[PDB]
Amino acid sequence: MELEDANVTKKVELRPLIGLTRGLPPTDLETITIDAIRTHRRLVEKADELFQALPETYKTGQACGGPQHIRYIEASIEMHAQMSALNTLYSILGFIPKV
Template sequence: MPPEHKVTLRPVVGLTEHLSKRDLEQITIQAIKRHRSLRDAAESKYEEWRKAPPSSGCDTVGPARIAYVSAMIDMHAQQTLLSTLLDVLGHVPLVPAD
């Protein structure tokens, strides 16, 4: 994505600009772990939606699809936060697999 279209959470930049690299790295690692957790939850909700019977009402996509879409929104919001933290930190810290 070209830099002019990159989403940066300015409040996060402001909150973290005076933190030490060690503290910022710790926060970034927590954000990476949270993103992984949200990704896993979204994948689980996707599988539940795919296995759910079709919604009988024409005015809703059904609770399984709504749960999946909500999980994806949470994951993408966290990704935006994580991208901002990585930009401020300047590198991707090593995070062991769970």
């Protein structure tokens, strides 16, 4: 499928994705990755929106702890974890698809 960036500084970070995707038809690996890209972008947007809605004392470090902060931290954890998977998919695919 259309490419964004060829030759990636590949890093399989999530070992089990190799077995999971071994044997898949190319188009299905592509579908999975494109969907992961879109999930990636939504997760980033969520995390960033939560960070911005934080009271200004939280951003600066003044404040910390508490539900709201925890919700932000959880959304960022989801984003970082899913980005690991996305990087792994790029490694397996060999390129970064254009979306």
